[PDB]
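Hello again,

I reread your note about wanting to compare the complex against the isolated chains. To keep things tidy I'm splitting this into two emails, and this first one only covers the full assembly. Below are the input lines as submitted, including protein chains and any nucleic acid or small-molecule components. They are followed by the predicted structure of everything together. The single-chain runs will come separately.
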Amino acid sequence: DSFVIRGDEVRQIAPGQTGKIADYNYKLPDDFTGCVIAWNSNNLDSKVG
Amino acid sequence: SALGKLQDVVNQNAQALNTLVKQLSSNFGAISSVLNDILSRLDPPEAEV
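Full-complex prediction:
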């Protein structure tokens, strides 16, 4: 799965979390046997204005 | 104190039952002893713990 969120909302993409992006947009299961990968993409995902 | 042994057995059974009932009011290291209160005051992970 691939999506683009902000910095202060990366901690919500984890098993057993709460908020607005982890409860209304995209929620992970309790176990979620896998791995979370994220990195900054300000080089090409933010234009002037 | 005519029926001593029978009364002692009855009292032991009553005390065992009362202790087994009262054991539901101990925290055992938790914040409380009410499952509903725990589920309403804690997040899913801490509530599960």
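For quick reference: The first helix of chain B runs from residue 4 to 22.

B.
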